Amino acid sequence: ASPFRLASAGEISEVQGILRTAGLLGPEKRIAYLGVLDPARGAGSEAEDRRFRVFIHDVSGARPQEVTVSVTNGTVISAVELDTAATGELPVLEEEFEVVEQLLATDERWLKALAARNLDVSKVRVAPLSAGVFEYAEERGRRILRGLAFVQDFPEDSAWAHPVDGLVAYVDVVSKEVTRVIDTGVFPVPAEHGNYTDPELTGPLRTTQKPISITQPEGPSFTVTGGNHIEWEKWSLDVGFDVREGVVLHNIAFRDGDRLRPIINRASIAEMVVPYGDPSPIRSWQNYFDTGEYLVGQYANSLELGCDCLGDITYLSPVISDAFGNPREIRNGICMHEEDWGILAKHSDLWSGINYTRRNRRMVISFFTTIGNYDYGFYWYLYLDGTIEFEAKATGVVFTSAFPEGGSDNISQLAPGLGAPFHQHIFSARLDMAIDGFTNRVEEEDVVRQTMGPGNERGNAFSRKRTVLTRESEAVREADARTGRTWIISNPESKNRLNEPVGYKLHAHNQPTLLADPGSSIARRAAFATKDLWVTRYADDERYPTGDFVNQHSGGAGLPSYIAQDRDIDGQDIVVWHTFGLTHFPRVEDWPIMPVDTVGFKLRPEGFFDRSPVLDVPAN
Amino acid sequence: ASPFRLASAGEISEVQGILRTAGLLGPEKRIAYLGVLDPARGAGSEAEDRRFRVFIHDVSGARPQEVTVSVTNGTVISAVELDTAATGELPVLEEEFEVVEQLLATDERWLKALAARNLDVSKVRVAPLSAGVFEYAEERGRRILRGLAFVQDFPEDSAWAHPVDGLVAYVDVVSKEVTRVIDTGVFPVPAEHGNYTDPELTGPLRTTQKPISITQPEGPSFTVTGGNHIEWEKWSLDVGFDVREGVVLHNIAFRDGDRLRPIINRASIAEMVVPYGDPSPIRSWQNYFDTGEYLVGQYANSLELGCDCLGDITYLSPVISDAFGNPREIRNGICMHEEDWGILAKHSDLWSGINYTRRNRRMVISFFTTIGNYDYGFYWYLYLDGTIEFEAKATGVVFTSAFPEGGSDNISQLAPGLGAPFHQHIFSARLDMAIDGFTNRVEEEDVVRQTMGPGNERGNAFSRKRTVLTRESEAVREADARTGRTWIISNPESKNRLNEPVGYKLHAHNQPTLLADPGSSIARRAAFATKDLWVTRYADDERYPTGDFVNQHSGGAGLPSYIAQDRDIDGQDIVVWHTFGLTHFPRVEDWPIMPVDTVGFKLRPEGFFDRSPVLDVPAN
Ligand SMILES: [NH3+]CCc1ccccc1
Ligand SMILES: [NH3+]CCc1ccccc1
Ligand SMILES: [Cu+2]
Ligand SMILES: [Cu+2]
Ligand code: NA
């Protein structure tokens, strides 16, 4: 009976009924987002109200609505008409993916461009790309997608190998109008195929790999109760799923003796953005927010035993709503399992004669999503020693273009005539902290170098300094790999046995943040991505670093507007937002299908325990 | 019959005989180092000469010697008397470990200090620490170790829990003289024990972990021929072992179609150093070079099946010489096995309908070493996609002190009265590069940010720049995480099918380098550690970044003297030296035995292949 339980098919069927009865789900309506709301702060009075938030699109041009529903009470709580010129358009609908291709396929300007390139319109796929906000005044308040074309030689052909460069179109998907067709010149369509299952390309498959068998002859070491509550090796948590964010972790806690100690209240990847660095007008508008614009959870893959997840796997199958409010099960959408992780601790002592070795392991919670050409795995790891780690795995097919004759400073060449524009993959982790409870503070820790002199006569000393972040206006922080900069989240009212505040240290990878010019449209809309670390005071409605409606929003929403409140964060209920990402200069080896590359972050205990928390691990 | 084969017991027995007959191994002699020499450059004329380098110490005060021997020809090639005031002392001998304790145990000044603290001399262990070079003129040319004391309450007690602070002694281990005893004040000896196998400390062991079984029902996928030649998943290499460096990788190559393509000629960890940042005169001299002063290979552990290495393990048992020239087998000293490594590549395509998933794996070559309180695992990883990775795993027991009343800026508190001085663990990887052959160059690659303006009107463009390093004097490089700085090793005379030079990219972790003041003794002796990247022209005798004789050398030897030759490195036979390390502010969780922390680097192909090299991997 947990309030953090997954949404059930029955709850979603009741939401649909409530919306229908209220007159909010007519035939011109589509559900663009549906998700359970987290319990409010201080629900410890026991009063379960299962509430759902719904974004409702209207395919006839009427104003969309934001609606909150209580399945517990069977009522509509609020329903607001949205002015989308003001607050942003709703997320892209799956059914709009093919509308862009179909509308262009009858437009004379589009047919004119394809005819000059001798392309059969029935072979031309059109990627449905988010539009952003640029110079085009006619787009304000309209639902616009932009289309870039790729040729499929036959139904099983990889279209990404055949970009049609020098051509882009803009489409109003509600009025079904093609607003602009821009043809800047003919580029040869790259001819080589990129079919990575074609024996002519792969050659004979390897016969040298032989099997690795990972089994757990006595089950797994974790238990799952109430559908989504995990207990594993003193860890406790709830695994949630949201159609926008994907896997969400709730109530991460560690059982230290007889005390259950909270660490993180809610952990999610709350936004991601892929900005492209090609200045060609064909692509210079291209930045897609996979989380905020497309909703990564609704494209989660069904994960296959032995291929996607290997070992003794426990699956979760989350339920989401389709565009009409029917429940849709994502079969085997979340994989969970434990993994051997090498040596945990080891010492052979010359004086005591004792040899000691212990092995480590980790709990893995993962899902995969596919949005167009790109595929990402999201992995959360819990380790025996208290460490928490997130890892994103990027794979799929790189987004392509022509490679210009005479080269390019912003595109790399992958095959004859075929290019891949430079781009970044930037994530925002939202960590609603609860280190031993909700009274937390953040300190920035830098290494301090000391000069040779009095008190340091051999010039060997070095130290560290910690700076408390006391107000939101000073809590927008940059990495500094030079000085070993980390951030410590501590509880000043909870001390370890040495009388020091208990804490956790965040270790970043220190990769570059957003490279775009600070005056650009993307720097305004993805402002979170320009800094490595933000800290805010918790608030119910401050969910996403980019705001609630990312699609076609003019910018400034989210983190820069939250922190302007300049709230007290020194020993308060706080949220850490960590930006981290990959800067991708594509290489030949990324083609025709890209080997996984990774990025992430980790948190390690910092005086949270009174000694090593893994002294009670047995000797295998 | 490979020239890169491991040394055999028979070869070492012949070396001993040759040395004995030549009069070089009398009863006052000790072998401080013995190791096989790599074949000279251009031995492709086929002429095997197995040669060994030997450092010979004299326990009676005579001058040590460096000797080269050919077991092939049964002769002494050269024998040089060493002036150790000039070129450095020989590495610490294992038999000198207990000489420091035994000599102090009869010194009246030492007994005076223990008596005032009411310590029974039979309970006091003395750590044998390398001396470095500081202000003491009487030490030049003498073989000095310094001693710090720890109390063992009973034979199985962990002495590290009971440091005797405020007390240090210096010992001449050849003349058997205690040169100085420094007592700066009495500190309480910390009373809590740190016995991590005591049920009173651990509590009841966990009963919740249940087994993970990793098996390979058909063997392993790699083959071992000639004792130490590995073939695995198109990779080819030789696994060497040296008593100073430990595991060395030779002739790393990748079978691309019908061509065997070299990548790295020799890879090793050529030095490591642990500098302490406590300005107390009791410890301000403390910096130990585990590789150069103590020789990490001779302390390699015998690795246990199921505890140290899990799965289907193939072992190597390298042979080294003891101090008298007898062969000594390190049973099960090197573990090798392959490991599942998650998803390699994955894409589900919306237009072609093809779902594609492939799994990754890695080849692991590892050993563990223990020198006093510290334990390290060295791991080399080869991946299916051409990636090479090194990982160091640091564990064991932290070096301790008293925690001063009133605190400290350079020591953290681990238990009542017990401190752990700040320190670093810094490694030097020596990578004798051979990217498609020996004509290589290094480029530094930085991200380039571009301003909004003409040619970049939306302010989204970004680029990269590469700077060729042409001469040694310009090849001393610093990290820059901000700008995503990496280094590319390429072969300008070997091009991929796109006509670009083939290459590999080095990705660093960008951790802080040496923090000590640049005018300090350690900055002079560990000059390699002050910069992230060095490139030299290959030379036979340029083996270690610190020089051949690190112990008590006054500084400047090694890399700073090599690069002063200012040799051409633009398309030549070059060696990359990468500094990387951990800065350790010890935490409570590191006590009484430290959970593993890690650091390393990786190299990934950068246009080395003509497309993804893993298209021929099967579907499991
Ligand atoms: N990831 C969102 C961008 C996208 C969407 C659909 C096809 C190709 C690219
Ligand atoms: N790691 C070399 C320093 C050392 C050597 C022996 C005991 C304790 C410390
Ligand atoms: Cu990418
Ligand atoms: Cu350390
Ligand atoms: Na919080």
Ligand code: NA
């Ligand atoms: Na070389």
